[PDB]
């Protein structure tokens, strides 16, 4: 968690599937928990871009299936509103498998990444293409 991160609208609650944007071998990421979430009776925990989630891979190489891993959300597909007044969104939800230190089990991210997610994660920035 190399940085502080301003709040952005949540769009990926638990149960959400997002595309796996890295060449790790995983085709998707099923979110089961989101790091840093708090508690409310009946409220599904949920992630936005930049958040560290706990996920499993439903479609992908067996070596990665049946196993819970941390992932970082890199695009979000649900309109959120930066501090400069813009409501923006991506065409899709997506994340990359990571390790708790914030490093990346992937090797190069495909597709755009959000500005907030890449300020938070250097190791993710090191592999990002177009950001914001």
């Amino acid at each position: 968690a190399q940085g502080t991160k301003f709040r952005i609208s949540l769009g990926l609650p638990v149960g959400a599937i997002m595309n796996c944007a890295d060449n790790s071998g995983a085709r998707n990421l099923y979110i089961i928990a989101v790091k840093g979430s708090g508690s409310r009776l009946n409220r599904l925990p949920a992630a936005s871009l930049g958040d560290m989630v706990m996920a499993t891979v439903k479609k992908g190489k067996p070596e990665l299936r049946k196993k819970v891993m941390p992932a970082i959300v890199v695009r979000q597909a649900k309109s959120w509103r930066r501090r400069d007044g813009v409501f923006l969104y991506f065409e899709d939800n997506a994340g990359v498998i990571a390790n708790p230190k914030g490093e990346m089990k992937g090797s190069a991210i495909t597709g755009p990444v959000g500005k907030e997610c890449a300020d938070l994660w250097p190791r993710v920035a090191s592999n990002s293409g177009v950001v914001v």
Partner: protein, 386 residues
């Protein structure tokens, strides 16, 4: 039995009863502590809520991620035509609390204020204060005894101001008259200042300045009789439940065999006195000034009021306060604006702010143009003519 899963209570009980306020002017309950080593000055100010708009500005907040980067922020606009002093009220410390000792008024009063004392102004014989004024007869024989009476006694002096309603676009005609506590110095310079201001207006640059954190005291938008789902934030009940979902399921246990004061019920929502604190003043606008919507970065002469005019309000022709964010109450409602009761040093306060830009697009729709000029410059000429 115990509960099963714990969850916080719904709704705040220090905001009860949730009834309708006694009047639509929310009582300004506490005034600031008086520092008497400073000039006689007002502590609050009446207002009229006009509407909201949007601004951009640089951000000076070192160590933030939006330091020196522009931000855009909602703002509320209060139409504040200068208010006219017409009275002085003095209160004494007593073992049962503050007691009003006497009131003394200006020699003459706008009929828009005298309207405050009638329910049928039109059919009256408008005799209110006709015979009081006669105490001004020779030299102010009686009135100067009272003013001395206040000076002798009177731990606290309050001045009776009233809004110049006629200077706004409302259909009202009947002004709002209010007490405002003089935090001056010496209960005497306080009441001289009152006499030296009878029927003399007080503008608002006297009272507030840019970046001053201030509180807003008004009466919440009414909403009528509300079910408990929306009124208290209760969980909407499952699709299958017979007899209704917008309900609380267990109005209470068997014992105490009484529905208790703490359980959400259906009833009135909105129309509650709210004192809301710490809204930074972003601009203090002059009516006797063109280019209210102008800024040192925008610099294109325009008023504050937006194209089409503030929706459900009208145009801004007077002094105005432009405060950051939002305030209790709807457009057209009287709005008391208190000076802050403590000296905030948060540095979210204390931050000098300079508007880069003030949106003035239409609010009656998806407003595309800042000024009728730039519409034409964009569109061209049109058939009806020009």
């Amino acid at each position: 039995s115990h509960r099963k899963y714990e969850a916080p209570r719904h709704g705040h009980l220090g905001f009860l009863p949730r009834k309708r306020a006694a009047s639509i002017r929310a009582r300004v309950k506490a005034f600031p502590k008086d520092d008497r080593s400073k000039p006689v000055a007002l502590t609050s100010f009446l207002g009229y809520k006009a509407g909201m708009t949007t601004i951009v500005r640089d951000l000076d907040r070192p160590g933030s991620k939006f330091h020196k980067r522009e931000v855009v922020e909602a703002v509320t606009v209060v139409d504040t035509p200068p208010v006219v002093v017409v009275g002085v009220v003095g209160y004494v410390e007593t073992p049962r609390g503050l007691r009003s000792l006497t009131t003394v008024w200006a020699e003459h009063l706008s009929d828009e204020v005298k309207r405050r004392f009638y329910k049928n102004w039109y059919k009256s014989k408008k005799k209110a204060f006709t015979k009081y004024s006669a105490k001004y007869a020779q030299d102010g024989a009686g009135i100067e005894r009272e003013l001395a009476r206040i000076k002798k006694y009177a731990s606290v002096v309050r001045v009776l101001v009233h809004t110049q309603i006629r200077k706004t676009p409302l259909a009202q005609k009947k002004a709002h008259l209010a007490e405002i506590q003089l935090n001056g110095g010496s209960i005497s310079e306080k009441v001289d200042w009152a006499r030296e201001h009878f029927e003399k207006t007080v503008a608002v640059d006297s009272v507030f300045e840019q970046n001053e954190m201030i509180d807003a005291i008004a009466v919440t938008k009414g909403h009528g009789f509300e079910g408990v789902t929306h009124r208290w934030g209760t969980k909407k009940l499952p699709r299958k439940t017979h007899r209704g979902l917008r309900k609380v399921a267990c109005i209470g246990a068997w014992h105490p065999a009484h529905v208790m004061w703490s359980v959400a019920r259906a009833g009135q929502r909105g129309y509650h006195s709210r004192t809301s604190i710490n809204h930074k003043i972003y601009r203090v606008g002059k009516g006797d000034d063109e280019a209210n919507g102008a800024t040192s970065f925008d610099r294109t002469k325009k008023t504050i009021t937006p194209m089409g005019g503030f929706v459900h309000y009208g145009e801004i022709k007077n002094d105005f306060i432009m405060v950051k964010g939002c305030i209790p109450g709807n457009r057209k409602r009287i709005v008391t604006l208190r000076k802050s009761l403590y000296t905030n040093t948060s540095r979210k306060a204390l931050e000098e702010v300079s508007l880069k830009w003030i949106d003035t697009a239409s609010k009656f729709g998806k407003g595309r143009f800042q000024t009728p000029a730039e519409k034409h410059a964009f569109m061209g000429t049109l058939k009806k003519d020009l």
